[PDB]
Amino acid sequence: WTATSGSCKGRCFELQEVGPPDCRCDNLCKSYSSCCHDFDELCLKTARGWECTKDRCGEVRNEENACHCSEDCLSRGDCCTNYQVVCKGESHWVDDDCEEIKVPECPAGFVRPPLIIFSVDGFRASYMKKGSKVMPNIEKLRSCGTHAPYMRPVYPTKTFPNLYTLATGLYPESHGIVGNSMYDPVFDASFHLRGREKFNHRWWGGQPLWITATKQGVRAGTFFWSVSIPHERRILTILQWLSLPDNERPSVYAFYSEQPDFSGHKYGPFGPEMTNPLREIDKTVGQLMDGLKQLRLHRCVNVIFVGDHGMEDVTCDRTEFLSNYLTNVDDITLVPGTLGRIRAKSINNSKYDPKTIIAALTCKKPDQHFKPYMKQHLPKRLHYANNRRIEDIHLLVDRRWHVARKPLDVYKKCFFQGDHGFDNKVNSMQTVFVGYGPTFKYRTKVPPFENIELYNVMCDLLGLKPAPNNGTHGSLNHLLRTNTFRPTMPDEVSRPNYPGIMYLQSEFDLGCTCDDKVENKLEELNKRLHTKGSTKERHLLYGRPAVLYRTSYDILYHTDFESGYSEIFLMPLWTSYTISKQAEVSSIPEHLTNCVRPDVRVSPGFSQNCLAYKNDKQMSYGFLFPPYLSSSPEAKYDAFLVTNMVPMYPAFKRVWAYFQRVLVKKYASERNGVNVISGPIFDYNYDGLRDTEDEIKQYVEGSSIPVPTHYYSIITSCLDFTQPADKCDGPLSVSSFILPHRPDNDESCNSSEDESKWVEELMKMHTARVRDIEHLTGLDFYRKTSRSYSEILTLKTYLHTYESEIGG
Ligand SMILES: *[C@@H]1O[C@H](CO)[C@@H](O[C@@H]2O[C@H](CO)[C@@H](O[C@@H]3O[C@H](CO[C@H]4O[C@H](CO)[C@@H](O)[C@H](O[C@H]5O[C@H](CO)[C@@H](O)[C@H](O)[C@@H]5O[C@H]5O[C@H](CO)[C@@H](O)[C@H](O)[C@@H]5O)[C@@H]4O)[C@@H](O)[C@H](O[C@H]4O[C@H](CO)[C@@H](O)[C@H](O)[C@@H]4O[C@H]4O[C@H](CO)[C@@H](O)[C@H](O)[C@@H]4O)[C@@H]3O)[C@H](O)[C@H]2NC(C)=O)[C@H](O)[C@H]1NC(C)=O
Numbered sequence: 001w002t003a004t005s006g007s008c009k010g011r012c013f014e015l016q017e018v019g020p021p022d023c024r025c026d027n028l029c030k031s032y033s034s035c036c037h038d039f040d041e042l043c044l045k046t047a048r049g050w051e052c053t054k055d056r057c058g059e060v061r062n063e064e065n066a067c068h069c070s071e072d073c074l075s076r077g078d079c080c081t082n083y084q085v086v087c088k089g090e091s092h093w094v095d096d097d098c099e100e101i102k103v104p105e106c107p108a109g110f111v112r113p114p115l116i117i118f119s120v121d122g123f124r125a126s127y128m129k130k131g132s133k134v135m136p137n138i139e140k141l142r143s144c145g146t147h148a149p150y151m152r153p154v155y156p157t158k159t160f161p162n163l164y165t166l167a168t169g170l171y172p173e174s175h176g177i178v179g180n181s182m183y184d185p186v187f188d189a190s191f192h193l194r195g196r197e198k199f200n201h202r203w204w205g206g207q208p209l210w211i212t213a214t215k216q217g218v219r220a221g222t223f224f225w226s227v228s229i230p231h232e233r234r235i236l237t238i239l240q241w242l243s244l245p246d247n248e249r250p251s252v253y254a255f256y257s258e259q260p261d262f263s264g265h266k267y268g269p270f271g272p273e274m275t276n277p278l279r280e281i282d283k284t285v286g287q288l289m290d291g292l293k294q295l296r297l298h299r300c301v302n303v304i305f306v307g308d309h310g311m312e313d314v315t316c317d318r319t320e321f322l323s324n325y326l327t328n329v330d331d332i333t334l335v336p337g338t339l340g341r342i343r344a345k346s347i348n349n350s351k352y353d354p355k356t357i358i359a360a361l362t363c364k365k366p367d368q369h370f371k372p373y374m375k376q377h378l379p380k381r382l383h384y385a386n387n388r389r390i391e392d393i394h395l396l397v398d399r400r401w402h403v404a405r406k407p408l409d410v411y412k413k414c415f416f417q418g419d420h421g422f423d424n425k426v427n428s429m430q431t432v433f434v435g436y437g438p439t440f441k442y443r444t445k446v447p448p449f450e451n452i453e454l455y456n457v458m459c460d461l462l463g464l465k466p467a468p469n470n471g472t473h474g475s476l477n478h479l480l481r482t483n484t485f486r487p488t489m490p491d492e493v494s495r496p497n498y499p500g501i502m503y504l505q506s507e508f509d510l511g512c513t514c515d516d517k518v519e520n521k522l523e524e525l526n527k528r529l530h531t532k533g534s535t536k537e538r539h540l541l542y543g544r545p546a547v548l549y550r551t552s553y554d555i556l557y558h559t560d561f562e563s564g565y566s567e568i569f570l571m572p573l574w575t576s577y578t579i580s581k582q583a584e585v586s587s588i589p590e591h592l593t594n595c596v597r598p599d600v601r602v603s604p605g606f607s608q609n610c611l612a613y614k615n616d617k618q619m620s621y622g623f624l625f626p627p628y629l630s631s632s633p634e635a636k637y638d639a640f641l642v643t644n645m646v647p648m649y650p651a652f653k654r655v656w657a658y659f660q661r662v663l664v665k666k667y668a669s670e671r672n673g674v675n676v677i678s679g680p681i682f683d684y685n686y687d688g689l690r691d692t693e694d695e696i697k698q699y700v701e702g703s704s705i706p707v708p709t710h711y712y713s714i715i716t717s718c719l720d721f722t723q724p725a726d727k728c729d730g731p732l733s734v735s736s737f738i739l740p741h742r743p744d745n746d747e748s749c750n751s752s753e754d755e756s757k758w759v760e761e762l763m764k765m766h767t768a769r770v771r772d773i774e775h776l777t778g779l780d781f782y783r784k785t786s787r788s789y790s791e792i793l794t795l796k797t798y799l800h801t802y803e804s805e806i807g808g
């Protein structure tokens, strides 16, 4: 109930929300069916349109008019946005030369430059270049301000997850908005685009920018606009609020456009009908900037022009149907479209089995346009698992395709030519970022970055302390002229031991053998030097990784590699080695095929044992530093140390072997040498975070050897590839991956072929940021470089996507 009898007189677009059933006059009241009776008449005036004309200049104020052209309008804050152009001979903002904004140029009583976020739905990154002819206002913001060639959204690349990720800095699994449609089993409640459930606060976790601001004494405009408020009125309202007295005036505002997404769905991302919505958005930017200039705020306000996701060509005839795969199609609920999420239609059905569902969906047709995953097996870069609203079964749908349950769902539940939602590394899902204002840099292009990073910057722009979030604060300092945040490196928590020779071979009863008793101060001094670290500067190029949790571990030096060996997990946390452009690949000698060697620096009690692997019929082992890349025959023995061994399924060893034998060398030739850091990851509860020992669900049979869920590698070289990786004077270049450690290669439909046809494709899907590895391991990398720490943060957030170059 709302007592709609009260009145909006002097309350139009009020900022505090009045508690029901007092009637509302704020910008969301329509959405709630709760506006006062006179809201439309008073607050949504439209008479005369939105532009001054020659003949309105100096008019006597008529309060009925949508906006005013009278002499008093500047100080009332309510002129048409083009008032000074038409009536005072001023130029439009877009017609002015751009001029660096070195300092904020703000009216008196402004305590900080205000922030205005101009968010546009479905604004695909290539529109910046492809529509530049019809968007001069946007083009000027882009060329004069700071811009990225594109910005990466979060998965899924849908509106509500991205809007709220923008607002909170959090992955959808943490903020809770995991799709446009959701079921929460604990509330037994459903969230949908249409309807009132979406308004319930329980869906929205984390702390969005407006709440962060409010809590810290920074006033915020109300960010959300009822759909029937036209864009012109949204702009005028923001501008009116900007005229409030100092003590009442917000410092942060949002405008939202439903375009170009809306037309994009109907016409496709480059339909000829798309020119007009792009022109109209640009005109709205024009209105805002002319309005700021009238208020003398165009060199005072920071403006962020930001999209949520792009748009791809998708039509009804590119739909896959679960009914062509599944026998019991009516025993499941599917969330359909550009992703698939599956659960049991009823919780009382105990004949529901995920494994059989996954199998009926795995590599079943030649050209299959979606791939089933249990959510914990999805690419860790998606961070899409640790939420009860995300169904255990997931379908990653190929770009340009839909998945649906049955053909009737598509003609009774074609109409559309565009959609979005696909994997966030897909080129057509990329969106835009432009920052313009005193706090942003002048004419600066910055590399592509992820939208999870912006909450921190928005907080920096307003002098706020960000709530805890998934951005890496400092990684976007390079976008800013001032207000940079200067983070410190985290402190190391555990210091390593440096064990020397402490154990005789006969103390080890591990059931391991090696044909190695097949052996002076020429070499005998040289080996001692190598075991004490004489080559460490070659193989440990950026310092040792720091351990940021309490544990017991040893540093182990070798000719060809250095490792941080965990006495708790019985394997290295990391293994670091450098392969130059010139290194050669050898094979494992025949006599060394099953060789494993006790490490006389590390006790029997803290070593793996070969017998466990022998007894465990599912589990084999591999090596972290690869024997194929040994610098010499003698050095090769080091690679067979029990301390360099890790458990691997035979199916995974196919992947790992090819990476270590073929691919490391390939990257060293292409990148002029590479440094590799590899190790295990344990994330049994799929939370993206390092497991403690008591969270491990699988061990090598009969032992306390924990089985990794994933293996990572970080591959660093010199960004200027004319310099070798081990003598790099400047910026670095990185790619990383987090490969799932799976007992089968079901994920790879072409796996029965030779690894040269399928392994590299798998590795690309599981591309990762260094930061994702840090969360997963409790390690901090790149602690000793010659680079600034902010630059290194930006490196750690880098994602190598393998997409072709954005454009054409
Ligand atoms: C991305 O950035 C974020 C933000 O930093 C990272 O997420 C944080 O991770 C923290 C560490 O894991 C986690 O800390 C826990 O908080 C618990 C208190 O939780 C509430 O309070 C906070 C504070 O305001 C709030 O933000 C939380 O919000 C979550 O839940 C609400 C309501 O359900 C949702 O609205 C919201 O969406 C959010 O959900 C997300 O997080 C929860 C987990 O908190 C998930 O379950 C959801 O799926 C979703 O992802 C909460 O309202 C606190 O109780 C925890 O403490 C336990 O564990 C510690 C170990 O040190 C121990 O000291 C305690 O004993 C305690 O154990 C007890 O509970 C256990 C579980 O029931 C039980 O097993 C034990 O036996 C004990 O009884 C813990 O400190 C933090 O809450 C989240 N924050 C957010 C916003 O998600 C995220 O990790 C980052 N991701 C990556 C990849 O880096």
Ligand SMILES: CNC(=O)c1nc(N2CNc3cc(OC)c(OC)cc32)sc1-c1ccc(Cl)cc1
Pocket (backbone or CB within 6 Å): 117, 119, 120, 121, 159, 160, 162, 163, 164, 166, 167, 168, 209, 223, 224, 225, 226, 227, 254, 255, 256, 307, 308, 458
């Ligand atoms: C992709 N979108 C956004 O990021 C976004 N959208 C907004 N509005 C405002 N009014 C509105 C009405 C809608 O429906 C009518 C709507 O539907 C989906 C969305 C919105 S505000 C905003 C935003 C602005 C700043 C920050 Cl920090 C975070 C988010």
Ligand SMILES: [Ca+2]
Pocket (backbone or CB within 6 Å): 682, 683, 684, 685, 686, 687, 688, 689, 690, 691
């Ligand atoms: Ca974990």
Ligand SMILES: [Cl-]
Pocket (backbone or CB within 6 Å): 156, 158, 178, 179, 180, 181, 335
């Ligand atoms: Cl969804």
Ligand code: NA
Pocket (backbone or CB within 6 Å): 612, 613, 614, 615, 616, 617, 618, 619, 620
């Ligand atoms: Na075995």
Ligand SMILES: [Zn+2]
Pocket (backbone or CB within 6 Å): 122, 159, 261, 262, 265, 420
């Ligand atoms: Zn859309």
